[PDB]
């Protein structure tokens, strides 16, 4: 049994109180108060539509994925990754796909900087989408469950779905459950063919073991995964540490050339 699986069982043992104290212990998170207030008033400039704009920003500002050209955003939800990429100088097109409907977030229209190169499309199940030419492949799909075997299957399905989109392009792909042995085997095969590394984002909650497979990096996958399981296990053992609060992103306004 893996370190990750032991973490999961401990997480499933927690009360809602213990869980709520645990999920943010020691993490980093952005302050959404201003954005939530302005979005509630219908403002369409400056605000990120979700915490996701800041999450992708963390990887980009570290050169782990460098978005360029035609960007595909699989599972875009409200659009936080798509709107963020739309303001980056090398990006020329952003196409987001998400399921919508009951249980799922719908794209939110915005006029943040570069909005004119974004098209977000709801009613799209990516597991039925034919792959398209693109220079950056982004994917943030993976629903948590209390069952890690369910999570194993959802993770493997995503990795099998993304591979035909990958053709010597930039990428950032969520790996919901990276500690199950079968997932490891797949990731190791994928890194051999397409390179990259798995990376833990500091803005991810302790309630998920998600890691992101990014195109610009090298490293040992098993080692990076076990380090996260050790980190998440250690955070059970202490009284809640309040999260390191950071400033949310300002996505600006206006068209781009
Ligand atoms: C964590 S959210 C992504 C957030 C987004 N990156 C942002 O910045 O706001 C994951 C999204 O994937 C969508 N999703 C889940 N399964 C999907 C599927 N099979 N096809 C398309 N979208 C899916 C969910 O509805 C959800 O909106």
PDB file of N, CA, C and O in Angstrom, residues 93 159 165 184 204 233 240:
ATOM      1  N   UNK A  93      -4.843  32.334 -29.754  1.00  0.00           N
ATOM      2  CA  UNK A  93      -6.215  31.850 -29.740  1.00  0.00           C
ATOM      3  C   UNK A  93      -6.388  31.042 -28.481  1.00  0.00           C
ATOM      4  O   UNK A  93      -5.458  30.339 -28.075  1.00  0.00           O
ATOM      5  N   UNK A 159      -5.754  10.745 -18.763  1.00  0.00           N
ATOM      6  CA  UNK A 159      -4.428  10.614 -19.365  1.00  0.00           C
ATOM      7  C   UNK A 159      -4.524   9.943 -20.729  1.00  0.00           C
ATOM      8  O   UNK A 159      -3.788  10.291 -21.656  1.00  0.00           O
ATOM      9  N   UNK A 165      -3.996  14.707 -28.153  1.00  0.00           N
ATOM     10  CA  UNK A 165      -3.814  16.128 -28.288  1.00  0.00           C
ATOM     11  C   UNK A 165      -2.360  16.562 -28.170  1.00  0.00           C
ATOM     12  O   UNK A 165      -2.069  17.706 -28.451  1.00  0.00           O
ATOM     13  N   UNK A 184       0.959   5.723 -11.873  1.00  0.00           N
ATOM     14  CA  UNK A 184       2.402   5.928 -11.973  1.00  0.00           C
ATOM     15  C   UNK A 184       2.917   5.321 -13.275  1.00  0.00           C
ATOM     16  O   UNK A 184       3.571   5.989 -14.088  1.00  0.00           O
ATOM     17  N   UNK A 204      -3.168  24.331  -4.180  1.00  0.00           N
ATOM     18  CA  UNK A 204      -4.029  23.179  -4.032  1.00  0.00           C
ATOM     19  C   UNK A 204      -4.298  22.871  -2.541  1.00  0.00           C
ATOM     20  O   UNK A 204      -3.412  22.996  -1.679  1.00  0.00           O
ATOM     21  N   UNK A 233       0.291  13.931   4.842  1.00  0.00           N
ATOM     22  CA  UNK A 233       0.184  13.164   6.076  1.00  0.00           C
ATOM     23  C   UNK A 233       0.655  13.962   7.271  1.00  0.00           C
ATOM     24  O   UNK A 233       0.031  13.920   8.344  1.00  0.00           O
ATOM     25  N   UNK A 240      -4.441  23.349  13.009  1.00  0.00           N
ATOM     26  CA  UNK A 240      -4.576  24.067  11.742  1.00  0.00           C
ATOM     27  C   UNK A 240      -3.619  25.255  11.729  1.00  0.00           C
ATOM     28  O   UNK A 240      -3.574  26.025  12.685  1.00  0.00           O
TER      29      UNK A 240
END
